[PDB]
Write a protein that binds this DNA or RNA. Structure first.
Lengths: 104, 141
RNA sequence: CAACUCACGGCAUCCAGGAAUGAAGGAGGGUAGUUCGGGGGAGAACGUACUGGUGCGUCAGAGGUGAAAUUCUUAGACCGCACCAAGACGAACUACAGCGAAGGCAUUCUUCAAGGAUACCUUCCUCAAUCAAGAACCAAAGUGUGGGGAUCGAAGAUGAUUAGAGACCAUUGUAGUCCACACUGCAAACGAUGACACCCAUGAAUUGGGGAGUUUUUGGUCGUAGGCGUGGUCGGGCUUGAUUAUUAUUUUUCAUCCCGUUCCUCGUCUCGCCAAUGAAUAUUAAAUUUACGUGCAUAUUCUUUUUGGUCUUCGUU
């Protein structure tokens, strides 16, 4: 399985800020997107299919992501905007049925 | 205002009112002049030598102690460059841009620039034949 | 030829008597901050949407307008779902914000050369300003050759409205819109404000860079009291450079290459005694400036394993 995880985030004003700009530089931005791609390719590399989806659905990833990110520049939200599948492994009976367990 | 661009800079250096050298220096003339020429042998230009020599040896303005300036020193020892630093710099720059354009023919910005550079070459050259320091047979390309 | 107080003399002899005003709130050139930005070119991917197609369902309307008609349909339109194709474009975020000499420039990553600002006790020492001639660049529309053709669309066609409508409106449609290579130099190309330099009152705001500082020079005895580092002497190793070596005439054969203290010379640091910047009885444009605190903060990885050791299942006692 081979995937795409669209993301999105936004900057956040400091609590004592008196300025009506919140705008970032360029280097700042790029770091975030660097240190995003890396992590989502490091966690999911050694994690299998059914093992993966359970992270995304419950928003486990979002925790580990944002809590790294924040001291690069402050973030207001991070979300996973959309998730998509590209290349699939070929059909199997057992790997399938073993992932549903009992069938009601 | 900038010579053939636009911009106003004011980044600058202002050396002190006193033209006498510090108390704390333990060099004298000899020591200085040595270190100048010595580093010149590497292929440093006057600029680079002076910067190295403030950051290691604490001699700020060479002229104050040695009683003469970097380029004079090197001329007397025959290590001064045949084509002077300032224009040679330009020429080097220009060539690189020309190389780039042999592969990048839809680039426009680069060529606007190249004009400006080549122009500047001329003007400098003409003040190094007004002031004798080049042959009169000098030419760019 | 050497030796040889000092002199004459000989030596493609050397350095110093600062030997050449200053370093413009002019220009140029350096060095640095992974500096700064929808600046420019190239390559690789991404995103929905419009349009077309294929498959799977349903069944009679759908388009369109003020009201209609032109138009498409039981050969299944329109609509719903999945997928594929092709060309163009990059929403919201996007602003009295950024970059570029203008015209102009918004997806992401990689890459190629450039430019501006700031910082400097760096270098050079008037190299500059402006501008007939000449040269380069230049929105959109147009012209040529080849390619592309999804969307919109001059010309044209059909349907309306109107006294008339070859107009606004509806459905279509060629050139064009896109790309490459040549041509053109015609804009409300506008801030309707030519370029360069100086002087000049006020309160908030915004983009980029940099800074936020208070006991020194040590002089004289330089005084080995100590330490550190370098070059010399034996020693160790080294076919070190000349070199027995290399055939075990291996016999070396030495200052030496690489290592090498208790030795001499030199550099520097530590330690030291003394000396150097802190005395008000009255103030004319001031001799010394706030603050210095908050919020966030990686086990941050893959392992192939192989020698034991806990287990298990066959034969046999």
């Amino acid at each position: 399985y081979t995937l795409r995880l669209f993301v999105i985030a936004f900057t956040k004003k400091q609590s004592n800020q008196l300025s009506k700009n919140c705008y970032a530089k360029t280097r700042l931005v790029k770091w975030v997107r660097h240190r995003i791609t890396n992590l989502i390719r490091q966690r999911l590399s050694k994690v299998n299919i059914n093992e993966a989806v359970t992270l995304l659905t419950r928003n486990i990833l979002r925790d580990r992501l944002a809590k790294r990110c924040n001291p690069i520049v402050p973030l207001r939200d991070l979300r996973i905007r959309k998730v998509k599948v590209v290349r699939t492994p070929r059909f199997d009976a057992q790997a399938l049925l073993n992932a549903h367990g009992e069938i009601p | 205002v900038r010579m053939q661009g636009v911009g106003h800079g004011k980044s600058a250096s202002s050396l002190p009112f006193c033209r006498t050298p510090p108390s704390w220096l333990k060099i004298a003339s000899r020591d200085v002049i040595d270190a100048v020429c010595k580093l010149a042998k590497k292929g440093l230009t006057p600029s680079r030598i002076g910067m190295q020599l403030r950051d290691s040896m604490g001699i700020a303005q060479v002229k104050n102690v040695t009683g003469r300036k970097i380029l004079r020193i090197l001329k007397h020892k025959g290590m001064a460059p045949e084509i002077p630093e300032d224009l040679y710099c330009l020429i080097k720059r220009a060539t690189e841009m020309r190389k780039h354009l042999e592969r990048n023919t839809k680039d426009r910005d680069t060529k606007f620039r190249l004009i400006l550079v080549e122009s500047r070459i001329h003007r400098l050259a003409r003040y190094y034949k007004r002031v004798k320091q080049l042959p009169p047979t000098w030419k760019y390309e």
